[PDB]
Amino acid sequence: FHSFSFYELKNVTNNFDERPISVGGNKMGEGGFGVVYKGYVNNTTVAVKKLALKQQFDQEIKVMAKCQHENLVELLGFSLCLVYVYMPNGSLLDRLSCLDGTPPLSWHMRCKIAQGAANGINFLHENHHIHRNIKSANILLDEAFTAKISDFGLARARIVGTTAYMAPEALRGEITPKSDIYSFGVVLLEIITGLPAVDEHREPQLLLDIKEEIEDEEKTIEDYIDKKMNDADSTSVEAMYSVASQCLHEKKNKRPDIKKVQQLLQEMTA
Amino acid sequence: GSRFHSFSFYELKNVTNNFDERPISVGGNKMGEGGFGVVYKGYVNNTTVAVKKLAEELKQQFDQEIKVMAKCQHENLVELLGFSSDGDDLCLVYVYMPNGSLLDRLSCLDGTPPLSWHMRCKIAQGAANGINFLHENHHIHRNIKSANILLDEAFTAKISDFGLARASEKFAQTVMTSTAYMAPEALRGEITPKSDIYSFGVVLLEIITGLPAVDEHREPQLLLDIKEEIEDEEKTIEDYIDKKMNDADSTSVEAMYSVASQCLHEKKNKRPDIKKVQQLLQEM
Ligand SMILES: COc1cc(N2CCOCC2)ccc1NC(=O)c1cccc(-c2ccn[nH]2)n1
Ligand SMILES: COc1cc(N2CCOCC2)ccc1NC(=O)c1cccc(-c2ccn[nH]2)n1
């Protein structure tokens, strides 16, 4: 890694200009733990996450020091700010919602993204880490649309997480990689549907609840498939939905482990 | 709380031997403790009473317990006599429940006899009747646990600890979360009576098994997780029945377990409401 002065990071982000990119500012995204800014270090674009907590900073540095992998975003350095390699296609959330005029993700691309994200999770679990905040806002996309996991402030070798992605045992305070599998199930539903994980104005508010609707025949998988893609065949969509459903089991021991999820996602496109 | 008496802190301090924290068994005044604080043996009008000494939000809980108790009297709810707020700490004074808490009795504290199966059935049915009264009167308890089901001389179940009770439902959920009795939707921030049913399901498992809702040294740590084991046939209901009672017929116990299992559905709309629970417990 490398040290950055706060002076430099202030300068390369137009003094942390919080206006969105689309207004001419530097803000690319925000969450409960900080704001992510576009920075220009000489000829290079970087992503600068400014936190807004110290233990999360230290923890993210720790985990990122220990965990480097092709489906994890690379941390360039630190200042509280964290500096990362810029991911030009932004977050999976932003692409699923077609923000900033981008075209919809194809089904083929969505499948490869699911596989890449699963590969990142597998690396984490092989190395005895739990992410604890898997969600579509934290899956970034490079120029090839390769999926890379970020946001490691909550990672682990005080109950905290993103409510709409949290397994019941995680909500109760258990620490297990099986909770990451559950969260990934919600991401798979986002990939299939193009809908957000929670929407207060929607029935059901939580996306994870469409599993129950489908099982009860109040809705079907077809009712929920993203209408904006045109290369999505029923067999593979139902295969992905099957993986998602399995990941969303209420009981941790009944969920597939990440290697099984990888197998199923491979067989989906095989 | 005009229904109740105001007691001075000085008198309560006096009659509890200056809040003597040693247990009753050695001549002190401490009867138990919880997240609310500590419950002491005291006296008013030459009568033994329970004195809960609580330990901005705390005052809100105090006021809320008083408000709920003012509104709700029933065979299966504890009775508040008065309150103290004039001294160093907030106190709530209740009618004494001589057989202590369901938790005390399930764990056989001080070497008390195990509750018989018939007594357990009476307690389950009575607790359900108390919850029904609350729900009929549009209250959500939010804190149903074996530690706050108290027991009179007839081993009648009396629900206590209304400081977190609510009288309005809410369905919005937290965006970021920043438990052994809590339903998933409650953990997500909803306020609904259906969550009380889930908590009651855990209490029913405690009644059947004699086990605590959570045990760090046990597999599984959470009692609610035994539902999975039984469904997998890795364990049977009989494997879990409290071995310390001897009048428990298998059919009745399995029926109570069925009620508990139904109460513990992960999805609130698939759980029975309290009136259905009452009915099933009567059929049991
Ligand atoms: C929402 O984050 C981004 C959005 C974009 N968009 C911005 C709008 O125009 C298209 C590209 C481009 C890049 C990013 N993010 C990154 O390059 C990046 C790199 C490393 C971590 C993170 C991140 C996002 C949330 N937590 N961590 N983000
Ligand atoms: C744990 O509380 C008690 C324990 C006992 N034990 C204590 C040990 O000796 C035998 C009797 C006897 C009585 C009580 N409690 C009450 O009489 C009482 C009455 C009304 C409310 C409460 C209470 C306790 C916690 N929340 N609410 N407690």
CATH code where residue B25 lies: 3.30.200.20
Same domain, A131 and A242: yes
Final residue in a domain of this structure, among B96, B128, B160: B96
Domain that holds residue B183: 97-284
What sign does the CA torsion over A172, B280, B157, B4 have? positive
CA-closest residue to ligand 1 atom 25: A138
**B26–chain A Cβ distance below 8 A for any pair:** no
CB B253 within 8 A of CB B208: yes
A87, A99, A132: residue to mutate for ligand 1 pocket, most atoms within 8 A of CB: A87
Contact B222 A172 (CB under 8 A): yes
CATH of the domain at B159: 1.10.510.10
Distance, in Å, from the CA atom of A68 to the CA atom of A71, rounded to the nearest integer, reads 9
CB B126 within 8 A of CB B75: yes
Contact A159 B182 (CB under 8 A): no
Same domain, B89 and B109: no
SS3 call for B157: strand
Question: Which tokens sit at B58?
Answer: 């705390």
What b-and-e string marks burial along A228-253, b requiring 16 or more CB atoms within 10 Å of the CB? ebeebeeebbbbbbebbbbbbbbbbe
Best A135, A158, A165, A172 member to test B by mutation, with max B CBs in 10 Å, is A172
User: Chain A residues with CB inside 8 Å of B175's CB?
Assistant: 32, 162-164, 198
Distance, in Å, from the CA atom of B37 to the CA atom of B57, rounded to the nearest integer, reads 14
Rg (CA), chain B: 19
Question: Which tokens sit at A209?
Answer: 């609840």
Q: Which residues contact A174 (CB under 8 A, 6 or more apart)?
A: A252, B221
Same domain, A103 and A144: yes
Rg (CA), chain A: 18
Same domain, B199 and B146: yes
Same domain, A40 and A76: yes
Contact B179 A173 (CB under 8 A): yes
Contact B228 A173 (CB under 8 A): no
Same domain, B103 and B219: yes
Same domain, A239 and A164: yes
Resolution reached, in Å?
1.4
**B230–chain A Cβ distance below 8 A for any pair:** no
Final residue in a domain of this structure, among A28, A55, A86: A86
CB B189 within 8 A of CB B174: yes
Count of domains observed in chain A? 2
Same domain, B103 and B81: no
Question: Which tokens sit at B52?
Answer: 């809960």
Same domain, B177 and B222: yes
User: Chain B residues with CB inside 8 Å of A160's CB?
Assistant: 176-178
Distance, in Å, from the CA atom of A132 to the CA atom of A152, rounded to the nearest integer, reads 8
Peptide bond just before A204 cis, omega within 30 deg: yes
Same domain, A170 and A129: yes
- Of A90, A91, A70, A73, the residue nearest A82 (C-alpha): A73
Same domain, A142 and A232: yes
Same domain, B3 and B58: yes
Final residue in a domain of this structure, among A37, A58, A86: A86
